[PDB]
Design a protein around this ligand. Structure first.
Ligand SMILES: Nc1nc2c(ncn2[C@@H]2O[C@H](COP(=O)(O)OP(=O)(O)OP(=O)(O)O)[C@@H](O)[C@H]2O)c(=O)[nH]1
Ligand SMILES: Nc1nc2c(ncn2[C@@H]2O[C@H](COP(=O)(O)OP(=O)(O)OP(=O)(O)O)[C@@H](O)[C@H]2O)c(=O)[nH]1
Ligand SMILES: [Mg+2]
Ligand SMILES: [Mg+2]
Lengths: 177, 18, 415, 180, 180
């Protein structure tokens, strides 16, 4: 079971890695403690297929507070994925970075957040605005040091009405606390 | 045919209001 | 400001959960079921629960309760709107809303939940737009979400340009036991299935009373819609300026406007029912249905539900037109009529037995509800005047629409 | 000779036609041309020279040659008068002081013996402010009814909205083409 | 059983092989991997985590798994030791103070009973400054000849130039593949 799943996830075949990822996702949804296999799924994270990347990101987000020490092996992957040409991949990486409740991980995520704050893609801009609010909620001091308030304020006075509304909501949430 | 009343074509605008 | 959107089941098991802020522990869902059971058993059950400092506000679905936990003073209306949008998206993607699809569509369900809301703030809710970026069978997100027009995908092309409208009427009457109607309101529903090429800017025009008064023609038959709720595509500013209904119709069936005005006319169907219920001996149902609608309109599938006794057995129906059947599951007499011409009068004489032993507790008097549906009959008298279909390329549209008259909250209080 | 090829071409549409874009500067001529060609209100710098474009509608290639309203470009409208079949005049109802100048320029351009087959095409540009006149006050001020042997038609078009462009195009097609 | 399909696959090339990329931080490991995969000196930030890539040469897919030399990532090399067939060590001859640390890290990584079939692959990185040692002084200091049951090979590769990469790849292919 667990050994077979680990062997399948540690293989060089994508058809088996996808099946292992799907089984791990179903086990977590079915109510199975799959946090012990978080380090094993870390190796099979940088994959070209977008279907398995989303599952890996969801598992890391749901298995980040449980194993914060094992989450230190994902900062490089997040940094690499924060510059993908596809806006969907960048938005997913930004959402996953802010969803990880790791004290030692949000500190290194300031640079990707700053890079994606001025992203031309409106989806990327909205993802960065949401990630800034998430980081401020997690660490207000880190957000203030990163100087994201000035970037958030300029979001309202820019194009992309959806992105402007997202930035306004993030600013209201930050000011609410 | 269709239950609930046959579909009828609609106009383009109020031709009598210019 | 939801903290974690989760989907429960009928046995208390969380079919799927998706935390958005992480400020609420995932173990609080277990206490939601006991709290709901306690609230239901004491009459204090409400859609918004409260587990200490965490509030569990959710609605009841077909088979699972989409409870969304929250901790701060989040907007309850916003949470309800997000839950409704999620339910609509699930219905659009999955034909059935039950546990059969929750455990079978998790791969796409998780992606849809992640994309719908981030950090508790929803960003995308259009099923048609969302179907171009999240599929269960991924390219860059469409420009429609980034663009202002998020309800009409660009580049749509069809062989023909036909738009089917549906002016569905809702005749709701609240007739008290004394014989008078208290709440008699008719709510319009303009549902259109737009199927055209490109992104046409529809210019809907009807014989509104306000529009007729402004133009100076406030003397003909004009619909006096007290409340008009336009869709997202309908420009609120244009309607506020000079009653101009200009909006881009979406691709598919959607609700453009939902009129709602009071009705001061006599009911289309008048039901005169009597209860000659003997004291544990028998019961008589002298129910007579009078059609006050126009004779040119036929109320197809007329179903006047007469609530019979719950413990009644060996019932006999002596009617004139239409089949009368008693359903023990519903505990009422269904006066089903296939075709009900306007001005017709159907008389029924119910006769059912009753046990000698009296019931232990009272059962109440449910109101009698009719299910009349007369097509091609507009009670409000509102008629579509024009539909300005304008396209940059230039094409000849073929708009269509039909008027359907049905019964909404048309209940009759019993004696 | 045989005209079978011409008949075959005309069976599916062969006539194209032409059009002109003249008027005062900042009169919505460039924006009107962009809306006719693309369908968006594009902001452009003042037309120092000229802009040449084409519009495909009703199986007729309506080529539009935008001409600026600059003083140095006002006398340059005679260059486009050669091999020209149509002419569109863009009025500026939002410039009361420039209305007289536009009328004088139109009269000067309409007093040429070479431009005779070009029918009048008056477009009411900038039809978005309350100060804009109607479709008859502007024509009455410009004296469009006094243009003998000139088929003029006044149409109000909103640069921001685009309403009335289809009506103007249909009128131009009906004036140019005299068939079913 | 039948092995006709395997023979047909091997007739045109079937073996791929693997490789590892470990060493001290700022040792040219990322630049070496970029040169092997792409062929350009790409400047990258320090490897907080790891980089996984593949190289196609001589009909063998030489997959390279770059590993950083950070203190927090030094003990993380055991994660890649599972299902690993090769190992490449990148030395830092330009860091005299870090040479001892790199040698200690290599000895610690070479003292594992699980990583036994991975032959030694010493790459002389940063072979562009006069302070860099030769191919024997570095090996003598590291004691590569004292690694019993270890097939080590020292090769000098210039990060800026790329010379010696082909020789190292050929040596790795000859050590991994024992056929014609
Ligand atoms: N906002 C707005 N401006 C309009 C409208 N109609 C005309 N204008 C003005 O008219 C100008 C149109 O300029 P262009 O579209 O670039 O071309 P043009 O009309 O030939 O002007 P020139 O290039 O100077 O000759 C714009 O700069 C606007 O200021 C309108 O409906 N709305
Ligand atoms: N200019 C120059 N720099 C070199 C050369 N060889 C190695 N370096 C240095 O080595 C570093 C190589 O870093 P990367 O290529 O990003 O990857 P790395 O070797 O694993 O270093 P880390 O990422 O910190 O672990 C560069 O920053 C250079 O400063 C060379 O030949 N020329
Ligand atoms: Mg211009
Ligand atoms: Mg590196």
């Amino acid at each position: 079971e667990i050994f077979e799943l680990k062997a399948e996830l540690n293989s060089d075949k994508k058809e088996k890695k996808k099946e292992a990822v799907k089984k791990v996702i179903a086990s977590m949804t079915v109510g199975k403690d799959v946090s012990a296999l978080f380090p094993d799924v870390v190796n099979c994270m940088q994959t070209d297929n977008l279907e398995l990347k989303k599952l890996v990101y969801l598992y890391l987000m749901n298995y980040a507070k449980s194993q914060p020490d094992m989450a230190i092996m994902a900062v490089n992957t997040f940094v690499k994925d924060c510059e993908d040409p596809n806006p969907l991949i960048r938005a997913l990486a930004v959402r996953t970075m802010g969803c990880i409740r790791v004290d030692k991980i949000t500190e290194y995520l300031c640079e990707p957040l700053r890079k994606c704050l001025k992203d031309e893609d409106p989806y990327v801009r909205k993802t960065a605005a949401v990630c800034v609010a998430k980081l401020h909620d997690i660490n207000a001091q880190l957000v203030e040091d990163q100087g994201f308030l000035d970037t958030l304020k300029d979001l309202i006075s820019d194009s992309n009405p959806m992105v402007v509304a997202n930035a306004v909501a993030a600013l209201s949430e930050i000011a609410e606390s | 045919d269709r239950k609930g009343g046959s579909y009828s074509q609609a106009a383009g605008s109020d031709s009598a209001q210019s | 400001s939801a903290s974690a959107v989760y989907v429960l089941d009928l046995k208390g098991k969380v079919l799927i959960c998706r935390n958005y802020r992480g400020d609420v522990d995932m173990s609080e869902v277990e206490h939601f079921m006991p709290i709901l059971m306690e609230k239901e058993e004491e009459g204090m059950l409400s859609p918004i629960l409260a587990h200490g400092g965490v509030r569990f506000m959710w609605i009841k679905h077909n088979n699972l309760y989409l409870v969304a936990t929250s901790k701060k003073n989040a907007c309850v209306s916003l949470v309800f709107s997000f839950l409704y949008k999620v339910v609509q998206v699930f219905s659009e993607y999955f034909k059935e809303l039950e546990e059969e699809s929750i455990r079978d569509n998790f791969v796409i369900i998780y992606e849809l939940l992640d994309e719908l809301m981030d950090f508790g703030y929803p960003q995308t809710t259009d099923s048609k737009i969302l179907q171009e970026y999240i599929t269960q069978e991924a390219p860059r997100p469409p420009a429609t979400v980034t663009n202002a027009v998020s309800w009409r995908s660009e580049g749509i092309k069809y062989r023909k340009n036909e738009v089917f409208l549906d002016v569905i009427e809702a005749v709701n009457l609240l007739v008290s036991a004394n014989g008078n109607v208290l709440r008699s309101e008719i709510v319009g529903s303009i549902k259109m299935r737009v199927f055209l090429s490109g992104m046409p800017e529809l210019r809907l025009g009807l014989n509104d009373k306000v529009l007729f008064d402004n133009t100076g023609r406030g003397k003909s038959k004009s619909v006096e819609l007290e409340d008009v709720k336009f869709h997202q595509c309908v420009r609120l500013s244009r309607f506020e300026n000079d009653r101009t209904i200009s909006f881009i119709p979406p691709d598919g069936e959607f609700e453009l406007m939902s009129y709602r005005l009071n009705t001061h006319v006599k009911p289309l169907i008048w039901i005169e029912s009597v209860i000659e219920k003997h004291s544990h001996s028998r019961i008589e149902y002298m129910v007579k249905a009078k059609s006050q609608f126009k004779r040119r309109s036929t109320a197809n599938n007329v179903e006047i539900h007469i609530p019979v006794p719950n413990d009644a057995d060996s019932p006999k129906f002596k009617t004139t037109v239409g089949s009368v059947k008693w359903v023990p599951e519903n505990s009422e007499i269904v006066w089903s009529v296939k075709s009900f011409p306007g001005g017709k009068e159907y008389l029924m004489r119910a006769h059912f037995g009753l046990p000698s032993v009296e019931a232990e507790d009272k059962e109440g008097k449910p109101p009698i509800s009719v299910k009349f549906e007369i097509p091609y009959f507009t009670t409000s008298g509102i008629q579509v005047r024009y539909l300005k279909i304008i396209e940059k390329s230039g094409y000849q549209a073929l708009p269509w629409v039909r008027y359907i008259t049905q019964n909404g909250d048309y209940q009759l209080r019993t004696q | 000779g045989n005209i079978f090829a011409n008949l075959f071409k005309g069976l599916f549409g062969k006539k194209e036609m032409r059009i002109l874009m003249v008027g005062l500067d900042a009169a919505g001529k460039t924006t009107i041309l962009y809306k006719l060609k693309l369908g968006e209100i594009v902001t452009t710098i003042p037309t120092i020279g000229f802009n040449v474009e084409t519009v495909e509608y009703k199986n007729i290639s309506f080529t539009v040659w935008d001409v600026g309203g600059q003083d140095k470009i006002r006398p340059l409208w005679r260059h486009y008068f050669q091999n020209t079949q149509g002419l569109i005049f863009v009025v500026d109802s939002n410039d009361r002081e420039r209305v007289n100048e536009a009328r004088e320029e139109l009269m000067r351009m309409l007093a040429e013996d070479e431009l005779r087959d070009a029918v009048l095409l008056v477009f009411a540009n900038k039809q978005d402010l309350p100060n804009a006149m109607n479709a008859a006050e502007i024509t009455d001020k410009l004296g469009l009814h006094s243009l003998r042997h000139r088929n003029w038609y006044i149409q109000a078009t909103c640069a921001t909205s685009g309403d009335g462009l289809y009506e103007g195009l249909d009128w131009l097609s009906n004036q140019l083409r005299n068939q079913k």
